[PDB]
């Protein structure tokens, strides 16, 4: 009864579309048409970090908003003190092909991974005084695209295996596996409460996941190409996705629909990274055109441009205190902006 | 004040610079091909290292990763060359090899990367031409070019088959590459031992043309 199940799936999809259409009584542009624009956002490179040699592939901020981990293709993590531009740590990696890096919320550990299909958790607070590999997680059958700490003992991972995983670092086992996507999962973002998390893949779809239940809740299907970047709105009721089709989008979980599209005709290059500001009024998106854009999250107008990089803006992050924005590019330089 | 932190950062910088110095002279290659192709046997994630005239070659075979391969090929946009191996003996799967070669050649991040092509398993191709091993494409219209330089003692059917396969791949090459990258066809076998020399020569040509472009020669 393959045809019967196919028809049932099509009918369910039509029902979902009808419910979404019914819920859409207005648009976020119309509702926000009376709110004052944010004006021209001028941001200047306050610090430039020049230790790296190869291309930067990921960075993450510490919860203290001061320390910063960056991963490069030359097989090197660097933990910097941004305030003083001096390197706290330089960790040499077994595999030079790193596509992700995460900083523990407590600051004790730092994770990395890539084409090795392994997520390596490194301990920083060693009594020996050197960063050791606390563990290697080796259950994925595809490249490691992203990873994010929940606490010191749980880490969520996304792979090109078309699956995500919730691990247990002490036992080195996949506590849970999320297996809904039909394509390489390229990014994930962890909710502020850590109960849920969103994942964007190359099937032009994003999915919301319950960490403890282990099941997909909602699937958002607006984009026309791969979703490279995903970030959560600060309040956990929305998220912004950046795709190869030179377009970002906003989705709200409760409405279960797309709200606004951040696109311009002069932009024909895909979005590499997406990040929000502390208030959520600024949506910073890195692009393949060697430069980053700053969008009015509510009015869709382009409020500013960060144009200091001479190669692809590989990664983009915003501090927990909203003080600065760190952009890392394929030119081997990280730049802090404010 | 804590100058010790700055001193530690300076030491970290020294070590990083030394590591970069060590790694700068290694020529990187990305080996990609089908399962039938004899990728492993060429050199005599998976990493391999070899040397020719004291230039280091680091060859990478991704192995267990994506098939669109597009999400990961961007990691290899600064390699010297892409070594593509095609099993010439298998006619039915040769269209698959041609399509994969077209995919790799027109990829956005590989517009500057040159491809070194190895039409492997040549003795099997010779054995299959035999009569029963007819050719799937519309091959009748093709005859060997006036500039053919066959290996001595090669049956003309064999040489025209070889040149047909090579012509197919180089046609896919020239039709879309805007002169920024060049494909280097070679015929190889299981017992062939000159492959490293061929990669060396091709890479020397690659860097020579990169220099010609850097100087606007």
């Amino acid at each position: 009864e393959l045809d019967q199940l196919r028809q049932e799936a099509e009918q369910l999809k039509n029902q979902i579309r009808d419910a979404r259409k019914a819920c859409a009584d207005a648009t976020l542009s119309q509702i926000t048409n009376n709110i004052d624009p944010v004006g021209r956002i001028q941001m200047r490179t306050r610090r430039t970090l020049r230790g790296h040699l190869a291309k930067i592939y990921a960075m993450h901020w510490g919860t203290d908003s001061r320390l910063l981990v960056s991963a490069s293709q030359d097989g090197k993590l660097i933990i910097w003190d941004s305030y003083t531009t001096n390197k706290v740590h330089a960790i040499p990696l077994r595999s030079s092909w790193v596509m992700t890096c995460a900083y523990a919320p407590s600051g004790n550990y730092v994770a990395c991974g890539g084409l090795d299909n392994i997520c390596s958790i490194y301990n920083l607070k060693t009594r020996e005084g050197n960063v050791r590999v606390s563990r290697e997680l080796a259950g994925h059958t595809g490249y490691l695209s992203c990873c994010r700490f929940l606490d010191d003992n749980q880490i969520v991972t996304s792979s090109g295996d078309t699956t995500c995983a919730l691990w247990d670092i002490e036992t080195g086992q996949q506590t849970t596996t999320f297996t809904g996507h039909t394509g390489d999962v390229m990014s994930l973002s962890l909710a502020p409460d850590t109960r849920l998390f969103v994942s964007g893949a190359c099937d032009a779809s994003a999915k919301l996941w319950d960490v403890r239940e282990g099941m997909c809740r909602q699937t958002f299907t607006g984009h026309e190409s791969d979703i490279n970047a995903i970030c959560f709105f600060p309040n956990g009721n929305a998220f912004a996705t950046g795709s190869d089709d030179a377009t970002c989008r906003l989705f709200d979980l409760r409405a279960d629909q797309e709200l606004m599209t951040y696109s311009h005709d002069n932009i024909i290059c895909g979005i590499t990274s997406v990040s929000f500001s502390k208030s959520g009024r600024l949506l910073l998106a890195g692009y393949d055109d060697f430069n980053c854009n700053v969008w009015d999250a509510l009015k869709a107008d382009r409020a500013g441009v960060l144009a200091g990089h001479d190669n692809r803006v590989s990664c983009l992050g915003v501090t927990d205190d909203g003080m600065a924005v760190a952009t890392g590019s394929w030119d081997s330089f990280l730049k802090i902006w404010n | 004040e804590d100058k010790a932190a700055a001193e530690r950062s300076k030491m970290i910088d020294k070590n990083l610079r030394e590591d970069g110095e060590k790694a700068r002279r290694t020529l990187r290659l990305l080996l990609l091909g089908a399962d039938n192709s004899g990728k492993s046997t060429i050199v005599k994630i998976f990493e391999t290292k070899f040397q020719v005239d004291k230039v280091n070659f680091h060859m990478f075979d991704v192995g267990g990763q994506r098939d669109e391969r597009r999400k990961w090929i961007q990691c290899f946009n600064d390699v010297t060359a892409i070594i593509f191996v095609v099993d010439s003996s298998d006619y039915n799967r040769l269209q698959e090899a041609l399509n994969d070669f077209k995919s790799i050649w027109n990829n956005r991040w590989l517009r500057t990367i040159s491809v070194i092509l190895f039409l492997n398993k040549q003795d099997l191709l010779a054995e299959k031409v035999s009569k029963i091993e007819d050719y799937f494409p519309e091959f009748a219209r093709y005859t060997t070019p006036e500039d053919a330089t066959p290996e001595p003692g090669e049956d003309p059917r064999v040489t025209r088959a070889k040149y047909f396969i090579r012509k197919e791949f180089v046609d896919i090459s020239t039709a879309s590459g805007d002169g920024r990258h060049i494909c280097y066809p070679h015929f190889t076998c299981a017992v062939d031992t000159e492959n490293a020399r061929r990669i060396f020569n091709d890479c020397k040509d690659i860097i020579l043309q990169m220099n010609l472009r850097e100087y606007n020669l």
Partner: single-chain antibody
Amino acid sequence: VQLVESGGGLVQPGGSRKLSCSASGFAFSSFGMHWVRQAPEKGLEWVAYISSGSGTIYYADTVKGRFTISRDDPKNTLFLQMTSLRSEDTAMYYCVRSIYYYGSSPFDFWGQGTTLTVSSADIVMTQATSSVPVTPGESVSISCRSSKSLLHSNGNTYLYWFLQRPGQSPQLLIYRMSNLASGVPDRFSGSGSGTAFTLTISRLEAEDVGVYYCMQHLEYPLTFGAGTKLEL
């Protein structure tokens, strides 16, 4: 992590000797190393410092020129060559590791020490009372004063606290007036105001009996105060 110091013994005035420290259990090359001294029945007195990379060396004005500090990272040893000696050098010499980066814990580990017997701009740390009578189960506060404010422009109050139990080497308790060192019970707390600082022990115990020392890491002529002795 263990530092074992060798050398020591009797010497006539004017002699010379090389104290050594063998380090085993940590990345010696990535640490700085301090030579500290304790005269018999007296307090601590910083002697020398050699940094990671052997690129920065500092000496006390009481030993400059006479003493030299060197390190052999390949075989993890730290040497103090004493060239001229006098009665005031008679003391127990300790070796202290100190790693410097953002959020680090300098002065975390101390050696057992070696006895050696010989037959104005510096910041002054004052600890109010020589001793305090204490009883188990109660809370005790130790006071320290600095001649110069230890609050730098970067917000770090560079005061450190150490506890020396009877017959053992000093152990770090707090390293920037507020941060508790690893392995120290939570009962210890530290507060300050830039020139006056207080260390509070919530509940006394048999382990807390000993001499408490304060130190400053603002200007590298590190200065200790005559510690307060908690005995009962």
